[PDB]
Amino acid sequence: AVSKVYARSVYDSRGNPTVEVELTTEKGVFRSIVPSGASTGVHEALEMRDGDKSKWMGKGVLHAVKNVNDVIAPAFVKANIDVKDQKAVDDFLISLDGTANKSKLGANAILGVSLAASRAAAAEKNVPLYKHLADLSKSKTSPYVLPVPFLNVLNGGSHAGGALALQQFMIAPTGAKTFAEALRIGSEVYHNLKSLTKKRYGASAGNVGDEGGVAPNIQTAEEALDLIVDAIKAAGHDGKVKIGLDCASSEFFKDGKYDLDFKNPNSDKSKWLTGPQLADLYHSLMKRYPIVSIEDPFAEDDWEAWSHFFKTAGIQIVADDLTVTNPKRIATAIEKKAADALLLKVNQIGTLSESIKAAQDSFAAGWGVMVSHRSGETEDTFIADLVVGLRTGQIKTGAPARSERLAKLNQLLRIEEELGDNAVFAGENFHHGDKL
Amino acid sequence: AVSKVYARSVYDSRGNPTVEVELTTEKGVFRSIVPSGASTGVHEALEMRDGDKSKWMGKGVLHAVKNVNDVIAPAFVKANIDVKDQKAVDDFLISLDGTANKSKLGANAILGVSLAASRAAAAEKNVPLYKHLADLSKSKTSPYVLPVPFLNVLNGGSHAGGALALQQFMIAPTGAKTFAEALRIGSEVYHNLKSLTKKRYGASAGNVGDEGGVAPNIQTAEEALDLIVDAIKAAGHDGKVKIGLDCASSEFFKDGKYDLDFKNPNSDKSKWLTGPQLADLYHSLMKRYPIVSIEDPFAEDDWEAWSHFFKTAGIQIVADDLTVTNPKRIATAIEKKAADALLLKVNQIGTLSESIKAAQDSFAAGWGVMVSHRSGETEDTFIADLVVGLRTGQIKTGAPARSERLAKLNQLLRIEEELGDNAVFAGENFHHGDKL
Numbered sequence: 001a002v003s004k005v006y007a008r009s010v011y012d013s014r015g016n017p018t019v020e021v022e023l024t025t026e027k028g029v030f031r032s033i034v035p036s037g038a039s040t041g042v043h044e045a046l047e048m049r050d051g052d053k054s055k056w057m058g059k060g061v062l063h064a065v066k067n068v069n070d071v072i073a074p075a076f077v078k079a080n081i082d083v084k085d086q087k088a089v090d091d092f093l094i095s096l097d098g099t100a101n102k103s104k105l106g107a108n109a110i111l112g113v114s115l116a117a118s119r120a121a122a123a124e125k126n127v128p129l130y131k132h133l134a135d136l137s138k139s140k141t142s143p144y145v146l147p148v149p150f151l152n153v154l155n156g157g158s159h160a161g162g163a164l165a166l167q168q169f170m171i172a173p174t175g176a177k178t179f180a181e182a183l184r185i186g187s188e189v190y191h192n193l194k195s196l197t198k199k200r201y202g203a204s205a206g207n208v209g210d211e212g213g214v215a216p217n218i219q220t221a222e223e224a225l226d227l228i229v230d231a232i233k234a235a236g237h238d239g240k241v242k243i244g245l246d247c248a249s250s251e252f253f254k255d256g257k258y259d260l261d262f263k264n265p266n267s268d269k270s271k272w273l274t275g276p277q278l279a280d281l282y283h284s285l286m287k288r289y290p291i292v293s294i295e296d297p298f299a300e301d302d303w304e305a306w307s308h309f310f311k312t313a314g315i316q317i318v319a320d321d322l323t324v325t326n327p328k329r330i331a332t333a334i335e336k337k338a339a340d341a342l343l344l345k346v347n348q349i350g351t352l353s354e355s356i357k358a359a360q361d362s363f364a365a366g367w368g369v370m371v372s373h374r375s376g377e378t379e380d381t382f383i384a385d386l387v388v389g390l391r392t393g394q395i396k397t398g399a400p401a402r403s404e405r406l407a408k409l410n411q412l413l414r415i416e417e418e419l420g421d422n423a424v425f426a427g428e429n430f431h432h433g434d435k436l
Numbered sequence: 437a438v439s440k441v442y443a444r445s446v447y448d449s450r451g452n453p454t455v456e457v458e459l460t461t462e463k464g465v466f467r468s469i470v471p472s473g474a475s476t477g478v479h480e481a482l483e484m485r486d487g488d489k490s491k492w493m494g495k496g497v498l499h500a501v502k503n504v505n506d507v508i509a510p511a512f513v514k515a516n517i518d519v520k521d522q523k524a525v526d527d528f529l530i531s532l533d534g535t536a537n538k539s540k541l542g543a544n545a546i547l548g549v550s551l552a553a554s555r556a557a558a559a560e561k562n563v564p565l566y567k568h569l570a571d572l573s574k575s576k577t578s579p580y581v582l583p584v585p586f587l588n589v590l591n592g593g594s595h596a597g598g599a600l601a602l603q604q605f606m607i608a609p610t611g612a613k614t615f616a617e618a619l620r621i622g623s624e625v626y627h628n629l630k631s632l633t634k635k636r637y638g639a640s641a642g643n644v645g646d647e648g649g650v651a652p653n654i655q656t657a658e659e660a661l662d663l664i665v666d667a668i669k670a671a672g673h674d675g676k677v678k679i680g681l682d683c684a685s686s687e688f689f690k691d692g693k694y695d696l697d698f699k700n701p702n703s704d705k706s707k708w709l710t711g712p713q714l715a716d717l718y719h720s721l722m723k724r725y726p727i728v729s730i731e732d733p734f735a736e737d738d739w740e741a742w743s744h745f746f747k748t749a750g751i752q753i754v755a756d757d758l759t760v761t762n763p764k765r766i767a768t769a770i771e772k773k774a775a776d777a778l779l780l781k782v783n784q785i786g787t788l789s790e791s792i793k794a795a796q797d798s799f800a801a802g803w804g805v806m807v808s809h810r811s812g813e814t815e816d817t818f819i820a821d822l823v824v825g826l827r828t829g830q831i832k833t834g835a836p837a838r839s840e841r842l843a844k845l846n847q848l849l850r851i852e853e854e855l856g857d858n859a860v861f862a863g864e865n866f867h868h869g870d871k872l
C-alpha cells in the first residue's frame with residue numbers, strides 16, 4: 001500500500017531544476033526523476049515552469065512540486081491504488097489533472113508518480129523493473145532483446161557555431177555481437193572522433209554539447225559525416241558501425257520552407273528549400289554514407305513533406321516532434337505513412353501507460369520504436385529498463401560521455417549481465433527488434 | 437555477513453571504463469563505483485589499467501575487475517568480516533595487496549570493496565550513509581554541517597585552448613543561508629556565465645569541459661576571472677559568491693620554474709616564473725578578486741614554494757597532488773606549513789579508513805578539508821554523504837552541469853531536506869565547518 005508520495009526539486013544535466021518523486025510502500029522508497037527537453041515540440045504535454053525571472057532564470061518547478069505534494073499526494077494515498085496496476089495508476093493521475101495536455105498539474109508533476117509507481121510495483125512482484133515493464137506491455141521475454149545504442153557523438157544545428165543545419169549525428173554499432181561490445185565500440189569511435197576533432201578544429205572543439213557529443217564549427221553535413229567515417233575507421237570498426245541522424249528540421253522551418261543556413265541572420269531566402277528539395281539532399285547523403293536512420297527529416301506538422309519522402313526513403317524514418325509520443329498523432333502518421341519509427345519520450349505524453357500504448361500501436365503498425373532520453377537528463381535510469389521491457393532493439397540516450405548518459409548505458413550492461421543467454425542483441429535487426 | 441563480492445566494468449563520465457563493486461549481505465546488494473582522475477598526482481595509489489590499446493584506448497580495467505573477482509572476493513567472503521568495522525575491512529584489503537601503493541591488486545580494485553562495505557554497514561545499522569560515515573570518523577552529529585559547493589564553472593590549462601595556464605575556476609556561494617539556496621545561486625551564476633561566454637567567444641566556447649564548466653579560448657587569468665565576476669554580477673549575487681582556484685601547477689612546473697604558457701611549444705624560457713614570482717602573481721589575483729581558496733598553487737613536491745607562499749597567503753590553500761589524501765604526506769605538509777586544507781579524494785589513497793584518517797589528521801592540525809570528486813566521475817554519490825559525515829563544510833564536485841556532478845549535488849539536497857533543523861549550512865565558515 002502506498003503510504004506516502006513526495007516531490008522535491010533536483011537539478012538536471014544542464015543545471016536546471018526538475019521534478020523528482022518518491023513513492024513509499026511496505027517495500028521501501030522508490031524514486032523517479034523527470035527529464036526535460038530543450039526545443040520541445042508544440043504538441044508535447046505541458047512541462048510546468050514557474051516563470052519567476054528572479055529564480056532559476058524562470059525555470060523553477062516549485063509549482064509542479066507543489067502540485068505533487070498538495071494535490072496528487074493526498075488524493076493518491078487516500079485512493080489506496082494498486083501500484084502493480086499501472087493503467088489504474090495512470091487513469092487516476094490523468095483524471096486528477098483533467099486536461100488534454102496535462103496543463104493543470106503539469107506533465108512533470110504527473111510523470112514522476114507514474115514512473116515511481118512502476119518501480120514500487122516491480123518490488124512488490126519481486127522482479128527487476130525491466131521484467132515488470134515487459135509484463136505491463138505484454139512483451140515477449142523469451143528471450144529478452146538488448147537495444148542497439150544510437151550515440152549522438154557530433155552536434156550541429158543550434159548546437160554548434162558552424163553553418164551545419166542538421167542537429168544530431170549518431171553512430172550505431174549494429175555490427176556488434178552484444179550490447180557490451182556495441183558500447184565498447186561506441187566509446188572507441190567516440191574517443192577517436194574527439195581526438196580527431198581537437199586536432200582539426202582545436203582544443204575548444206573538444207568541449208561537449210548537452211548530450212556529450214563534440215560540437216566543432218562545421219559548415220556542411222558532408223564535412224560532419226566524413227569526420228564520423230574517419231573516426232570509425234581510425235577506431236578500427238569500419239563495417240560494424242552505422243549512422244543515425246536527427247535533423248530537428250522544425251528548427252529551420254520558416255514560411256513553409258527549409259533554411260539550411262538558419263543560423264545566419266542574413267540567410268539567402270532564395271536558397272530556402274521546399275519539402276521535395278530537402279528530401280533530395282537527404283537521398284544524396286544516404287547514398288554516400290552508411291545512414292540507417294533519419295529522425296525528424298521534416299517539420300512537426302508538415303505531413304506532406306514526410307509522406308513524399310517516405311515513398312522512396314528506404315531506411316528507418318523516426319518521428320519525434322511530429323508524434324510527441326502521442327497515440328493520436330501516431331495514428332495520423334501511420335495513416336499518412338509519414339514514417340516507420342517512433343522516438344519514445346515518456347515525458348512528451350506524461351504517463352508510463354500512455355507511453356506503452358504509443359509503443360504498442362507503433363509495433364502493431366509495423367513501426368520500430370527508439371526509446372529516447374531528453375537533452376536535459378538526470379541520474380535516473382528508467383529508460384534503460386524501459387527499452388529492454390519494450391523489446392524495441394534500439395535506444396537513443398546520448399554519446400558515451402556525461403553520466404546522465406552513461407547511467408543508462410551502464411544500467412543496460414547490468415541488465416545484459418543479469419539476463420545472460422536469456423537475452424539477444426538486436427544488432428542489424430534493430431528496426432524490428434520487437435519481432436526477433 | 438558478506439556472501440558475495442563482485443566487480444564489473446562500467447563507464448565513467450568521460451566514456452572510459454572503471455570498476456564497479458557490489459557486496460551482497462543479508463541486507464541486499466550494495467554498489468560503489470570507483471572514480472578516475474586525468475593528470476593524477478605522481479604519488480597517488482596505483483590505478484590499474486589494462487594498457488591494451490586495441491580495447492578502450494588502452495584504459496580497460498579487466499585486470500582490476502579480475503583482481504576483485506578472483507583474488508579479493510574469495511578471501512574476503514572466507515574472512516567473514518564485520519562490515520561495520522571499516523578498519524577491519526580496510527586492514528584486510530591493504531594486507532591482501534601487500535604493497536605500499538596498492539600496485540598488486542590496484543587501488544581501483546580495493547576502493548570499491550572498501551566503499552561498498554560502508555554502504556552495507558549503514559544498511560545493517562539501519563542509518564543513512566552519512567550518519568554511518570560520521571560514526572566511523574567520530575564526527576559530531578549535533579548538528580550536522582552541509583557543505584558550501586565549490587563549482588568549477590570555467591576551465592583553463594590543458595583543459596582548454598588559449599594560453600591560460602590555471603586549470604580550474606570555481607564559484608562558491610558562501611553567502612547563501614542554506615545548501616539549497618547555495619546551489620540555486622550557483623546554478624544561476626553558471627547559466628549567466630554560459631550565456632556571456634557564448635556571446636563573447638561564440639557557441640563553441642559554450643560547450644563544456646569534463647567537469648561541466650565552459651572552456652573558451654582564454655589567454656589570461658584576469659580574463660577568466662573578470663568573466664566569472666561579470667557572471668556573478670549579472671546574476672545579481674555580487675558579494676554572496678566567492679571564487680576558488682585549482683592551479684594544478686604541477687602541469688606547468690619545469691625543473692624549479694613555472695611556465696605560464698606551457699601550452700605553447702615555443703614558450704619563452706626567459707619568462708618562466710620562479711616560486712616567489714608565481715607567488716606574487718597569486719597575490720595580485722587575490723587582491724583584485726574575491727578569491728577565498730587556492731588549490732595546488734605549486735608543484736606536488738615543490739615544498740619550499742608552498743611554505744614561502746603560505747607565510748602571507750591569507751586565504752585557504754588547498755593541497756591536492758601535494759598530499760594525495762595520504763596521511764604521511766599530510767604530516768609533511770603540516771610540518772612545513774605548506775597549506776591549511778586537504779583536498780580529499782578517496783581513490784588517491786585507496787580505502788575509506790585511510791581517507792578518514794587523512795581528514796582527521798587534517799582537522800587536528802586546524803586544516804580544512806574539501807571533499808572532492810575526480811575529473812572522471814560516475815553516477816556514484818558516495819562523496820555527498822562523505823562530506824556531510826565528515827562535517828567539513830566544503831565540497832568540490834563539479835559545475836552545476838553533467839549528472840556525474842549533479843548526482844552528488846542532488847544527493848546533498850536530499851540530505852539537507854532529511855536533516856532539517858538538525859543541520860546547518862557552512863556558509864562563510866566553510867574553512868572550519870568541522871568546528872561549527
Ligand SMILES: O=C(O)[C@@H](CO)OP(=O)(O)O
Pocket residue numbers: 036037038039040152168211246248320343372373374375376396
Ligand atoms: O530531439 C531529441 O530527440 C532529444 C534528445 O536527442 O532532444 P530534446 O530532449 O531537446 O527534445
Ligand SMILES: O=C(O)[C@@H](CO)OP(=O)(O)O
Pocket residue numbers: 472473474475476477588604682684756779808809810811812832
Ligand atoms: O585536480 C583536481 O582537483 C580533480 C577534480 O577537480 O581533477 P582530477 O580528478 O583529474 O585529479
Ligand SMILES: [Mg+2]
Pocket residue numbers: 037038039040041321
Ligand atoms: Mg526537441
Ligand SMILES: [Mg+2]
Pocket residue numbers: 246248295296320321343
Ligand atoms: Mg529529436
Ligand SMILES: [Mg+2]
Pocket residue numbers: 473474475476477757
Ligand atoms: Mg590531477
Ligand SMILES: [Mg+2]
Pocket residue numbers: 682684731732756757779
Ligand atoms: Mg586539483
